[PDB]
Amino acid sequence: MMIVQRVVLNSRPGKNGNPVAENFRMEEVYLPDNINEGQVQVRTLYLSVDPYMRCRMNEDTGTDYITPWQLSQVVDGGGIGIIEESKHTNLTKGDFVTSFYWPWQTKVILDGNSLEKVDPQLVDGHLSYFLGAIGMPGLTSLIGIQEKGHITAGSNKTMVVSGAAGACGSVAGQIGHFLGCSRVVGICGTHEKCILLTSELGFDAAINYKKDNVAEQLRESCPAGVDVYFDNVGGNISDTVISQMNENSHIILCGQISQYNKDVPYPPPLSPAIEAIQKERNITRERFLVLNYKDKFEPGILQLSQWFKEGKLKIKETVINGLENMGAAFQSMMTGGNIGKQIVCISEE
């Protein structure tokens, strides 16, 4: 058997704690030389780190749809890789495949049914985009705007995006334009991120929530009020944005990342005063889970790919190399180290 590398859950940061590299541990294991029927053996190419992973580090995730990682047991999540051998009928050597439950391990044997074959033509050979803008986060943004945004052509709505330079947010804000908003405004945590948004991703305006006065800034940037709020962050920023939303406007409730290191239910409730404004202005704020919309993934991916291949959709990702950097990359992502999608390159390939 060959010796490969592996990441396991070393320790829990606690429900109110910050996630650290050392919550994860590298190990070496043997990879069997034989596989069975229905199984395939894959070389891992890229792994995703994602904010929903935060809850899996707690003993309870607080939801059926997600189970907690176990200590000393290998961690798993979004991944893309290439088949090195298969005894699964629909899969053969050289196929590129993805899984939501890819073990953080350099080579791995999996059940052939848990995989889906991807077409590199969609991403122009840039496989990592399948875990970002042409994957789950891109779908979340496009489908979210579609199902919850209530943007019509012929309208000239203003959209605001929180977490606007992360995976979801960088994409959401371009889709906003594509779908006929007349104004898209971004809130992110760095000056460098604001530049990306206004100069590369074509956001009409960019605000830094750490160094700026968000409210004053939204007033200048959203002179007609906010009709759509694509919300990835929650907390105090969402409070500012909602205070300035128009009547019958819409919050796309994507994530609430500022709350992820706190012991509080999801989704958290608006404060009494902000809830009051929400009800008074007939603002919609419904829970959005992309996984409830599986049968729109096809068109979704086809659309995003199409926009990318037309030069319309701009894809940003931040790549770190090496399986022994998963922990560090998750920490970096949780604390705004990533521009666009945080991706880990597992292979010398």
For residue 347, state whether it binds ligand NAP (rule: CB under 6 A).
no
- Kindly report the number of other CB atoms within 10 A of residue 223's CB atom: 9
**Residue 338 marked ligand-binding:** yes
For residue 267, state whether it binds ligand NAP (rule: CB under 6 A).
no
Cα 174 to Cα 70, 72, 168, 203, 250: the distances in Å are 38, 41, 10, 7, 17
**Residue 257 marked ligand-binding:** yes
Distance CA 315, CA 152 (A): 25
Distance CA 264, CA 234 (A): 13
The token pair that represents 264 in the structure block: 């509080």
- Kindly report the number of other CB atoms within 10 A of residue 50's CB atom: 20
For residue 128, state whether it binds ligand NAP (rule: CB under 6 A).
no
CB of 103 to ligand NAP, least distance (A): 20
CB of 232 to ligand NAP, least distance (A): 4
Q: Smaller CB distance to ligand NAP: residue 6 or 316? A: 316
Contacting ligand NAP within 231-260 (CB under 6 A): 232-233, 254-258
- The conformational region for residue 282 under phi > 0 = left, psi -120 to 50 = alpha, else beta, is left
**Residue 91 marked ligand-binding:** no
Q: Smaller CB distance to ligand NAP: residue 112 or 176? A: 176
Q: Where are the alpha helices (DSSP H) in 103-207?
A: 136-144, 167-178, 191-195
Contacting ligand NAP within 15-44 (CB under 6 A): none
HSE-up (13 A, CA, CB side) for residue 103: 22
**Residue 169 marked ligand-binding:** yes
For residue 168, state whether it binds ligand NAP (rule: CB under 6 A).
yes
Distance CA 257, CA 267 (A): 10
Can you tell me which of 3, 273, 289, 319 binds ligand NAP, judged by CB under 6 A? 289
**Residue 195 marked ligand-binding:** no
**Residue 129 marked ligand-binding:** no
For residue 166, state whether it binds ligand NAP (rule: CB under 6 A).
yes
For residue 222, state whether it binds ligand NAP (rule: CB under 6 A).
no
Largest CA distance in the chain: 66
Contacting ligand NAP within 180-199 (CB under 6 A): 188-190, 193
Q: Smaller CB distance to ligand NAP: residue 51 or 81? A: 51
For residue 336, state whether it binds ligand NAP (rule: CB under 6 A).
yes
Distance CA 71, CA 116 (A): 28
Distance CA 245, CA 234 (A): 15
Distance CA 226, CA 218 (A): 9
Residue 332: closest CA among 198, 187, 189 = 189
CB of 161 to ligand NAP, least distance (A): 10
**Residue 193 marked ligand-binding:** yes
Stretch that binds ligand NAP, among 22-30, 117-125, 239-247, 287-295 (CB under 6 A): 287-295
Which element (helix H / strand E) includes 100? strand 96-103
Q: Smaller CB distance to ligand NAP: residue 157 or 193? A: 193
For ligand NAP, the binding residues (CB under 6 A) are: 50-52, 136-137, 140, 163, 165-169, 188-190, 193, 232-233, 254-258, 288-290, 333, 336, 338, 341-342
Provide the annotated binding site: 100-101, 166-169, 193, 209, 232, 254-260, 288-291, 338
